[PDB]
Write a protein that binds this ligand. Structure first.
Ligand code: 3NC
Ligand code: 3NC
Lengths: 379, 399
């Protein structure tokens, strides 16, 4: 039993505790949402509602206007496209600061039952506080989209990179190993990524690596494993392809490595289903002895796969031997490729029908609800 | 503008501002409300809904627990009953402090279209900061009732008082004049009482006076008037103008309170309402006929002045006492004596002081009937009905 003077402080806590589902900004998100989901001709016909909307008209419009809205960002150039919206480079009008804003169509997010997945991604990007993980500075929302303002990566994706260069075993060793420190960072936070791939790997102005998408992430329980409900084709791990009715990330890894030295998927197939079964037959489906080894050590069945035991076990692998870097020093050494940037907005490492809207309801559908609590300020 | 920072210079404000319809508490009130009006089987079948109530399940239960709830209060004795709930003496378990907590059935308040009246009552009691206005410390709500925790008044209502004594012109002069200072106080907060009556007049441990219920209050416009199609008040103590109100002429100023007061005074010296009648309607028309309904049993125990003052309040608005200034009333001959001056009457020795056993002597509160069958509940909705929305923002905690 707490006391008065106590309970009050304790409550101010929550009203400030940004990990709280009911941080002040989340309550405001609630009032906001509610006013959205209510201001419709049909519904306003109700005493209670119309009275409400008539009382929080002025006030809530004031709010909308003050809080962060998309009108606050100048969009320099679209630099990417996810499933539910586009990622565009931006500069804050009032602050002049430059971020990368990922967009999310509330609609598309509802149409597909693919809702409530971005919570893990928000949390991670906003509190991982890690050199390995992209940092979220702001997250806000209107009627149409979610917005995630985040540390811009001038470096570009590992995809563009592998496109442009004849990757040597050196580089390979570098990028791979960093991906390993990062994935271990994630797992330390008690999450599993489930989608490891070049498309998700970005680079900071210094040519080092972070992880840039976390939609796939899933919280792993006490025993370190997960009850699972896929992700990608060219990479995916079989052991998790049967639970449908951790070390999996490591599989994805090996796949990537192969892709990097080779120039194509370790189980590429013109037909996709082909790539699928081909991964199921992994056992039977220029380079160094070690490269080969390592790869095939990851590319094995769950229980005999490389990394089943400890991450350290992976670190120590022979292919991870050199006279150019140590592990807890890698982050600070000279990247294999460093980006030459003309300004704070060089979209050079990023190469070059539409969308609809929700239908006016006849009754309360509350389409804003799955989104209350998404607003986050970093100060 | 200009820019980001000023935006915050309004933001942080809207959250501190206790008079803001969106003070932090208000926002918490919104989320709470929502959870209530949402957690029902039929509704839950909605993906958006279900997902919501599944994310704020834990959290919202936490909130409910911490914030002020009624389980925080030990209910000493029921000392009163209004229209929408009972009014009970209580002591805070954790703090052991003693208050009077008035309840309000959210149902009953919805049943009758009589909703959204309590906001003016709350604002006044919480911000009047006046010797004449009972003070609110805390206001909270659950699914069922609104609660208003407020300065307890061991003194008792002037109805009990008038009951137990042969009130003399002195006393009369006292109570009445304090009623005037107080009504003037409310008048200056730009409000009209509309319901002046002994029932609303309470006493503090020093035998001095305050007004105790403000449901009837209504904010008056720049010209000092208000306009009310269907008007309120109490059968006996009603002003006639307020009385003859409808779709049409229902507009009146503050001197209607002054009428109510004259009624008071009569009641106090005579022992019955100036227009009492066994049938109510009778009192009504009797009021309409005041010019010739006014009388006094030929017991010359009444003063020239008393009678005077009384009749000066009980006249038609336009020629009634106080139409001009409150000062005008203050100066009246019946308000002449060598025992108190206006700007000092609060500080003097009350005409009756309560002898109290403890900090909980409910001695000046006669016994009342408990459960009279009044506790009824909302019916489980088939669709979202939003019954808690009218009460978003009612929560307020004291500095
Ligand atoms: N994960 C898949 C879907 C998301 C997409 C994606 O999110 N791409 C990007 C993410 C970020 C993150 C932070 N900063 C950036 O500049 C940036 C740029 C792009 Cl293009 C990548 C493929
Ligand atoms: N408006 C009518 C119905 C309500 C009734 C009423 O509210 N009475 C009371 C008001 C208060 C107020 C503050 N403190 C108290 O202790 C207290 C006690 C009672 Cl019995 C008055 C007549």
């Amino acid at each position: 039993h707490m006391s008065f003077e106590t309970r009050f402080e304790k409550m101010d806590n929550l009203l400030r505790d940004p990990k709280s589902e009911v941080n002040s900004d989340c309550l405001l998100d609630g009032l906001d949402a509610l006013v959205y989901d209510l201001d419709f001709p049909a519904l306003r016909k109700n005493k209670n509602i119309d009275n409400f909307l008539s009382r929080y008209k002025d006030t809530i419009n004031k709010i909308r206007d003050l809080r962060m809205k998309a009108e606050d960002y100048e969009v320099v150039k679209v630099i990417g496209r996810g499933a539910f919206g586009e990622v565009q480079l931006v500069r804050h009008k009032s602050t002049r600061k430059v971020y990368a804003m990922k967009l999310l169509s509330k609609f598309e997010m509802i149409k597909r039952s693919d809702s409530a997945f971005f919570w893990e991604e928000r949390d991670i990007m906003a509190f991982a506080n890690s050199p390995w993980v992209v940092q979220l500075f702001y997250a806000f929302q209107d009627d149409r989209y979610l917005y995630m303002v985040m540390e811009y990566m001038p470096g570009g994706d590992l995809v563009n990179l592998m496109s442009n260069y004849d990757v040597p075993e050196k580089w390979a060793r570098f990028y791979t190993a960093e991906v390993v420190l990062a994935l271990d960072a994630i797992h330390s936070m008690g999450f599993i990524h489930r989608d490891v791939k070049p498309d998700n790997m970005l680079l900071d102005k210094s040519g080092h690596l972070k992880l840039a998408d976390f939609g796939t992430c899933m919280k792993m329980n006490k025993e370190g494993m997960v009850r699972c409900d896929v992700g990608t084709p060219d990479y995916i791990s079989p052991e998790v392809l049967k639970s449908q009715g951790r070390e999996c990330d490591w599989w994805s890894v090996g796949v990537f490595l192969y892709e990097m030295l080779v120039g194509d998927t370790p189980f590429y197939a013109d037909s996709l289903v082909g790539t699928y079964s081909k991964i199921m037959n992994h056992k039977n489906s220029d380079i160094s002895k070690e490269a080969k080894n390592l790869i095939c050590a990851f590319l094995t069945d769950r229980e005999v796969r490389l990394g089943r035991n400890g991450v350290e076990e992976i670190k120590r692998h022979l292919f991870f031997k050199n006279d150019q870097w140590a592990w807890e020093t890698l982050r600070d050494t000279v990247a294999p490729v460093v980006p030459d940037l003309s300004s704070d907005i060089d979209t050079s490492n990023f190469d070059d029908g539409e969308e609809e809207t929700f239908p006016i309801p006849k009754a309360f559908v509350g389409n804003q609800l799955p989104f209350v609590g998404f607003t986050y300020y970093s100060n």
